[PDB]
Amino acid sequence: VMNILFIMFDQLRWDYLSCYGHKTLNTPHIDRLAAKGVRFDRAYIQSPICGSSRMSTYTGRYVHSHGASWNGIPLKVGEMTMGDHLRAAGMGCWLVGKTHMRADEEGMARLGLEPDSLIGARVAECGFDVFERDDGMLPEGPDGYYDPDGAKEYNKFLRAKGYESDNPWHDFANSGLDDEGNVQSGWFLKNATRPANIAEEDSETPYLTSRAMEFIEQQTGPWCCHLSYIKPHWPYIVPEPYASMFGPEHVQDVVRSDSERQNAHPLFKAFMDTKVGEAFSRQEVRDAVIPAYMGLIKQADDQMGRLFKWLEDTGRMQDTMIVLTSDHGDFLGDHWMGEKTFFHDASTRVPLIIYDPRPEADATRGSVCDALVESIDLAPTFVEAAGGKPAMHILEGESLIPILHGARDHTLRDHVICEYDFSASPIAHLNDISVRQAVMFMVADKNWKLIHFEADPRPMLFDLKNDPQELVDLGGDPAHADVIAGMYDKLFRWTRRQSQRTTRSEEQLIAMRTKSRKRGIVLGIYDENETPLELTVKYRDRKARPYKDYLKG
Amino acid sequence: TAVMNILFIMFDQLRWDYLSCYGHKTLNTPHIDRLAAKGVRFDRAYIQSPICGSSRMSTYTGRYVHSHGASWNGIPLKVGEMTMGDHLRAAGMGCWLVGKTHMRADEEGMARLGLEPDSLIGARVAECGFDVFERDDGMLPEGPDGYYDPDGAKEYNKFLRAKGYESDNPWHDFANSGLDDEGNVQSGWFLKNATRPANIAEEDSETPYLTSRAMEFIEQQTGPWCCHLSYIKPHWPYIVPEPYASMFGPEHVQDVVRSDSERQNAHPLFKAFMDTKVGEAFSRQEVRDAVIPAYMGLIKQADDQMGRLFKWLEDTGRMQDTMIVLTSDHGDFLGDHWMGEKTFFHDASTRVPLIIYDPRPEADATRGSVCDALVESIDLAPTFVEAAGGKPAMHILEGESLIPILHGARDHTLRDHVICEYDFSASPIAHLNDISVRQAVMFMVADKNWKLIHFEADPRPMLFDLKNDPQELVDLGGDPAHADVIAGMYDKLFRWTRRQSQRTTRSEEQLIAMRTKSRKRGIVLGIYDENETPLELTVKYRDRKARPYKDYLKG
Ligand SMILES: [Zn+2]
Ligand SMILES: [Zn+2]
């Protein structure tokens, strides 16, 4: 039986792995996975924020199709998920870590789905059976917890080892400590320079790695395990030795220009003119945060070394497909922005490495695929991997198995799509854009990236071949009107897709074309000679009496 | 306050121009005209797909076919798509069916969610949200591969057999067949037999029968109800009892709307719909001569039964408590535009009659008026929710409430265009023309001035100038002088395809409230030190004490 180990890191940039070219951050264990598999050089997520990116990946569907369009927007009860597609192919689907799922409680109540039943618990958890659900943080303020269940098992783990605090996740894993015993919260970016006040083996990435091994040891039958880490997502703080390993001298140059800010499209400027944008535009903030970010990733690589060594030693490596990816990047000050909520590659292009242990993937080991790839491709890839037939009237991406197995070196699509709905975001609050206007679309191929705003008639446009850093907006350039028209055609073609026709497969639709004519539907037939007599056997040669004769009783 | 009841009356395959209040010159429909005189008549109402199943699924969900996915006859409406019944029950009003829906249960989706067909919830999901007084999609065809719909006319056949009628298919032999002088059944499935009177007592035929069931339903009710009274006539078989069978002839039939140039210059996909057996059939004089008088006769019978129904409502004091809606799921070409049936976008199919009577005082001001604003069949669901006293969920429902028009707040809708869609990937015409599932789709966008038709199977659109060519005879889709108008209409279509119709788990109100929620729940971003944000936001993070981690560790 082949198993699938679906590994994801939150907020990990494509260019912060050495196999993707980082100059000072060496990630040999992840690089080694790539050397025995395929590295995807052009992989894009479908929304630049945790919740909606993940919901797209777990459904294999675009945000425009599934409707879970921002953090905390529930995925509706009707939408089937990865776990559903895999279980129909005989493979279990399990969670170790983060999903950012919010149950559609209203929808469940409407259909009488109980959250404590097998079917109900799965719907509430985005199709996963849960080994451990942890979205990876326990923030709190005057109105309470962002997520009361954050770090629930992790805090029990720390308290059992002897840590004591009314928030051990905060005080140890995500804060430093000064000489006088004062907790230095990792929520303050200046404290990113401090080592986390925790034994390194007890911090979050090593913890979740141990949990993955515990799951794998226990689980029989074919399984898919979504191993889903919160780091390098904030708080940006890491234990020794990773804390001391990097400094500002190791940070790659920020990618931005004065002209870019001067000539910023009004909606682009809006995302720069935020607390986070202005913060990460400051040298002292990048000097503190980015070496910590790097340390988090180096720690991840060491834990992948640990995990992969264990799969090898226990003989599981030859029967486990491994996928390694991210839900989105982090601008880290690039383009005068912080966080991730815009369309430049620094956020929307993600690392993606796939290792298929089977001999049919031998021909492509160590190769680099430069074809247009979307995160929604993972679901049909997994179904095919599990020996199933991907239901392509529901799943909108494409299986990557033909690429892995050397049947072709490219996908079939001619463009990728990303979407961002900021109707629920603090930023629409400030610029008071209407809910209906607070949305943007991205369409890109190898040559161009077009950004459409519903709140502004002018698009943004980047020449990806000659401006790969995406610093020069050509959206207002008359010389590019034809190119802009062409990309808009691509976006329009995509919006017209029939993504909601999920209740009949293409084969079933074709079969319906000839069914009714033999079931008595007779149209445009004047007399019995105008259609085959076989079709009207139920209608001809019949006898009856005048109706009055049946009624005179 | 809200109306107590909603009577939602629909006829299948009824044309907008075959009511005398919409201008028909020989077919007098005084009872329906009288209702129009008491209410508002909508002169520009369009359905969202030109075939029974998907038109109805759109109306019952308040959503476009592109949104709900039940895109042709027999394609199940997925579980989880909410229906009119759900919205109305949320507003405290029951929602009941008497007649046709063409609903097909999403059996796989129900199985997946553990939904049982016999539970209250499961039975409602299976029936498109309606509680069922009587489900009858209105016909019992049968061929060598069996019945199209085995449960067609199920209770109706029992009714007829109870009266003494005897047949293995009473619906066919009596209600939808004639009889010659030697006792030979003349099937209404052959159009030549449209000229024959149906071999059945008039009071026992389908439209009076269903009208009687509707009165049975209503008299059994205590408490607020919406009743979908859903007639199959004047949909085929085209045959009717006396006296309707004899009251019209070819001398009463309005001229066919078509031209030789229309045919000569037809777009290849337009031509494909002409080049069918039904198109060819209704292009023949003898066929229209037989069928259209029977079609008229069926409508005249429907008018007489509305008279009966409305008189009963008045006499029992229900007229004061009952909103009445009368409409159609689509028209019938009857040979117009060289086509039969209904599956294309000309007004003869896509524009439907729509009359709404609101008995409340606030609609007194608009009685007898005609509203020429762009209206869609998906407008009914939010209209009903608001009439029932609820707040329509406009993050789910895609149309607009017509209540402001009825109550005289404005005389127009807000939309700048209408949409109609036709997915023929499952249809005979796709087999006949070898069109792929992916390319067997067409879109219609129209306003008061223009109608644009987009085909996925051909790069050239069709375009009609509705203002100067209201009969839609002249295709301007290839005319270079209309390039800008075509671009402009495509912009309207593109705007509509970008709509966020699937974000149904959060309302506008909830999305707005979400904007500030995380701020006081510990999400602190871009903050360098405690002086860069208000102190209360970081109260759980500041001034805390701990020991070096080594000190906690032992064992
Ligand atoms: Zn994330
Ligand atoms: Zn119909």
CB B177 within 8 A of CB B199: yes
Tokens of A77: 């009860």
Sign of the dihedral defined by the CA atoms of residues B23, B27, B30, B34, in that order: negative
Residue B360 CA to residue B389 CA, distance in Å, equals 13
Residue A553: count other Cβ atoms within 10 Å of its Cβ.
Answer: 6
Ligand nearest to the CA of A97: 1
SS3 of residue A9 by DSSP: strand
Question: Cβ contact (<8 Å) for B109 and A518?
Answer: no
What's the CA-to-centroid distance between B524 and ligand 1, angstroms? Answer: 15
C-alpha to C-alpha distance for A328 and A347, rounded to whole angstroms? 5
Q: Indicate the residue type of A391.
A: A
B35 burial class (0-12, 13-18, 19+ CB within 10 angstroms)?
buried
Question: What is the per-residue burial (b if ≥16 Cβ within 10 Å, else e) of B179-202?
Answer: beeeeebbbbbbbbbbbbbbbbbb
Q: Which of B112, B56, B108 lies closest to B84 in space, CA to CA?
A: B56
Q: Establish how many alpha carbons lie within 13 A of residue B160's alpha carbon, considering only the half-sphere containing its beta carbon.
A: 29
Residue bearing tokens 């709900």: B68
For residue A385, the surrounding DSSP H or E stretch is: helix A378-385
B82 CA distance to ligand 2 centroid (A)? 21
Report which of B377, B340, B505 is spatially closest to residue A110, judged by C-alpha positions.
B505
Extract the runs of DSSP E, i.e. beta strands, from B136-224: 142-143, 146-147, 177-179, 185-187
Ligand with the closest atom to the CA of A234: 1
The reply to whether B550 falls in a domain is no
- What are the structure tokens assigned to A14, written together? 């494509």
Task: Write a three-state SS string for A192-246.
Answer: HHCECCCCHHHCHHHHHHHHHHHHHHHCCCCEEEEEEEEEECCCCCECCCHHHHC
Compare all CA atoms of chain A with the CA of B550 and give the residue at the minimum distance. A199
Asked if B226 and B96 touch (Cβ cutoff 8 Å), the reply is yes
Q: Is residue A34 part of a domain?
A: yes
End-to-end alpha carbon distance in chain B? 73
Give the C-alpha distances (Å, rounded to integers) separating B311 from B37, B38, B316. 15, 14, 9
Q: How far apart are the first and last CA of chain A?
A: 74
A453 exposure class (CB count in 10 Å sphere: 0-12, 13-18, 19+): buried
Which amino acid is residue B370, in one-letter code?
V
The CB density around residue B144, as the number of other CB atoms within 10 Å, is 12
Place of tokens 């945000």: A63
Sign of the C-alpha dihedral computed for residues A434, A435, A438 and A442 taken in this order: negative
Q: Report CA-CA distances (Å) from A36 to A13, A19, A32, A402, A411.
A: 21, 12, 7, 17, 21
Residue B328 zone, left/alpha/beta (φ > 0; ψ -120 to 50; rest): beta
Provide DSSP, B84-139: HHHHHHHTT-EEEEEE-----B-HHHHHHHT--TTSHHHHHHHTTT-EEEEE--S-
User: Whose CA is closest to B236, among B139, B351, B301, B304?
Assistant: B139
Type of residue numbered A522: V
Cα separations (Å) of B65 from B49, B62, B68, B353?
7, 10, 5, 21
Separation between Cα atoms, residue A189 and residue A275, nearest integer Å: 12
Q: Is A549 annotated for ligand binding?
A: no
- Way the structure was solved: X-ray
Quote the minimal CA–CA distance from B484 to chain A in Å: 15
Domain count, chain B: 1
Residue B378 sits in a domain whose CATH number is 3.40.720.10
- Is residue A165 assigned to a domain? yes
Can you point out the beta strands (E) in B142-266? 142-143, 146-147, 177-179, 185-187, 225-234
Flag if A181 and B547 touch (Cβ within 8 Å). Answer: yes
Q: List C-alpha distances in Å: B410 to A254, B1, B53, B273, B405.
A: 56, 20, 33, 40, 5
CA atoms within 13 A on the CB side of A59: 32
Element (H, E) at A459: strand A456-463
Nearest neighbour of B192 by CB, restricted to A106, A188, A526 = A526
Closest residue by Cα to residue A328 from A4, A51, A37? A51
Cα B452 to Cα B447: distance, rounded to the nearest angstrom: 9
For residues A543 and A399, give the distance between their C-alpha atoms in angstroms, rounded to a whole number: 60
CA-to-CA distance for A540 and A527, rounded, in angstroms?
11
CB contacts of A527 in chain B (<8 Å) are 190-192
Please say whether the beta carbons of B306 and B353 come within 8 A. Answer: no
Say if residue A420 is exposed, middle or buried (CB neighbours under 10 Å; 0-12, 13-18, 19+).
Answer: buried
What the block records as the tokens of B387 is: 């009439």
Distance from C-alpha of A393 to C-alpha of A85, rounded to nearest angstrom = 12
d(CA B483, CA B340): 31
Q: Is B48 exposed, middle or buried (0-12, 13-18, 19+ CB in 10 A)?
A: buried
Beta partners for B465?
Answer: B450
A531 in any annotated domain: no
Whole-angstrom Cα distance, residue B208 to residue B214?
10
In a domain, B36, yes or no: yes
Render the burial of B235-266: b for 16+ CB within 10 Å, e for the rest.
bbbbbbbeebbeebeeeebbebbbeeebeeeb
* Cis-peptide into A232, omega within 30 deg: yes
Of A418, A301, A242, A221, which Cα lies nearest the Cα of A7? Answer: A301
Contact yes or no for B545 and A441 at CB 8 A = no
In a domain, A511, yes or no: no
Cβ contacts of A77 within 8 Å, gap of 6 or more: A104, A107, A108, A110, A111, A113, A123, B80, B113
For residue A263, the enclosing domain spans 1-502
Query: How many CB atoms within 10 Å of residue A262?
Result: 8
Question: How many Å separate Cα B100 from the centre of its chain?
Answer: 11
Round to whole Å and give the CA distance between A523 and B287: 12
Q: Which residue in the block uniquely carries the two structure tokens 């009825």?
A: B406
Backbone phi and psi for residue A238, each to the nearest 5 degrees, phi listed first: -145, 150
Q: Please tell me the total number of residues recorded for chain B in this structure.
A: 555
Q: How far is CA A122 from CA A73, A87, A299, A377, B394, in A?
A: 17, 12, 32, 22, 29
Distance CA B386, CA B402 (A): 9
The candidate with the shortest Cα–Cα distance to A420, out of A453, A374, A397, A445, is A453
Residue A46 lies in a domain: yes
∠A48-A51-A54 over CA atoms, to 5°? 80
Q: Is B132 on the interface with A (CB under 8 A)?
A: no
Interface of B with A in 408-447 (CB under 8 A): 423, 425-428, 430-431, 437, 441, 443
Residues shown for chain A: 553
Is residue B551, in this structure, part of any structural domain at all?
no
**Backbone region of residue B471 per phi and psi (left: phi > 0; alpha: psi in -120 to 50; beta: other values):** alpha
